[PDB]
Paper text:
OxyR, one of the major ROS-sensing and -responding systems identified 35 years ago in enteric bacteria Escherichia coli and Salmonella enterica serovar Typhimurium (S. Typhi), is an LysR-type transcriptional regulator (LTTR) that is characterized by having an N-terminal DNA-binding domain (DBD) and a C-terminal regulatory domain (RD). As best illustrated in E. coli, OxyR (EcOxyR) becomes activated when a disulfide bond is formed between two conserved cysteine residues located in the RD as a result of oxidization by H2O2 (6–7). Most OxyRs belong to the dual-control (type II) group, acting as not only an activator of peroxide‐scavenging enzymes under oxidative stress conditions but also a repressor of the same target genes under nonstress conditions. In this study, we attempted to unravel mechanisms for functional irreplaceability by carrying out comparative analyses of type I EcOxyR and type II OxyR of Shewanella oneidensis, a representative of a large group of Gram-negative facultative Gammaproteobacteria renowned for their respiratory versatility and the potential application in biogeochemical circulation of minerals and bioelectricity.
Numbering used by the authors:
A (entry chain A): 91 to 175, 178 to 299
B (entry chain C): 91 to 179, 185 to 298
């Protein structure tokens, strides 16, 4: 029964595009009798889906509200800020130097907006472009068009989201500028061995 | 004032990462006094925002429900089926079950690819229910199935640093139309036609 059967897995669109294929291919090779029924959605709808019984496991970015659930941290990944290679000004980043609507952020339903704001210490909301984005690939294209800057997760950079771009990587304002990756499941699960195995595989996948 | 002032423009996630940056770049170079207040969202939510006044202009497809609005077609982009480089060889029902990767019905590209490629067998669809074509590209590059892709994604380099090859899907009209949608009672007729010509030249 462990590592066998149908498991309905949820993963947020800031994690799934550059982790999920390696998660699924390894489980196909090592556990071919386990069928992962995936779903890509944002955090609140994913936790709700776990509440209704729609899903059994969620791959989330950890600092969210997981009340009534069990949550296991499986890794960290830092934040970076990207600019076209031609406006590199100063490495210790002052947010007040930047022009007015020049920091692109996803719609606030994506947890990466709040995580990047709190972790990289963005205090001036006037610095935030009024783009209501949903894809970080769109923002990478916007920054590559010299239209501003954005925060990128490290796991996006390591999978070549900056390929075919003139973007460069900077270190954001410090004081723990990272994001926790974690696994979420119901407290009444009967598949704790499977979820701990998936967590160990994901943690090892987060190099 | 044509190309001056605030314009609230919405774009679907299956078009935006391949055209929106170039649209905004050319607009702020040729018309620097027009501010594009942008939004990425799916077709029904963009239509709801257009009807309630939250947005003024939408970049969508043509074959969606645009009752009570004005649609202008600005071009086409073909549908192409992409597969891993090792896995190759009119594309009939040879494919196994749960193999075609499709986005949720929330995104119009699913219905567009289904109707334009004559996909009548749902059993060949993998039950992913995705939202991002880049995730599906990563899944196909891991030898996990097929997916449909718009030509504008391939032109923007979505197959770069992958091992995917392009195949012609079995459709009589294997393409998707692109269009601009706005309220019929608008006064910015010249601005919207200008942006439509701009997008049409870009496509």
């Amino acid at each position: 029964e462990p590592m066998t059967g149908d498991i309905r897995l949820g993963c947020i669109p800031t994690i799934a595009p550059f982790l999920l294929s390696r998660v699924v291919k390894q489980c196909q090779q090592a556990y071919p009798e386990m069928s992962l029924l995936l779903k890509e959605d944002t955090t609140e709808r994913l936790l709700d889906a776990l509440g209704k019984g729609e899903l059994d496991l969620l791959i989330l970015a950890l600092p969210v509200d997981t009340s009534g659930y069990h949550s296991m941290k499986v890794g960290i990944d830092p934040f970076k800020m990207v600019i076209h290679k031609v406006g590199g000004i100063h490495q210790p980043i002052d947010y007040q130097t930047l022009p007015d609507e020049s920091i692109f952020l996803l719609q606030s339903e994506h947890s990466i907006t709040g995580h990047a704001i709190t972790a990289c210490q963005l205090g001036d909301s006037a610095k935030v472009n009024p783009f209501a984005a949903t894809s970080l690939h769109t923002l990478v294209q916007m920054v590559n068009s010299k239209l501003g800057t954005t925060f990128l997760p490290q796991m996006a950079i390591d999978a070549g989201i900056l390929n075919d771009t003139d973007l460069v990587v900077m270190t954001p304002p410090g004081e723990a500028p990272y994001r926790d990756i974690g696994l979420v499941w119901r407290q009444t699960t009967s598949r704790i061995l499977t979820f701990r195995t998936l967590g160990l595989l994901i943690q090892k996948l987060l190099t």
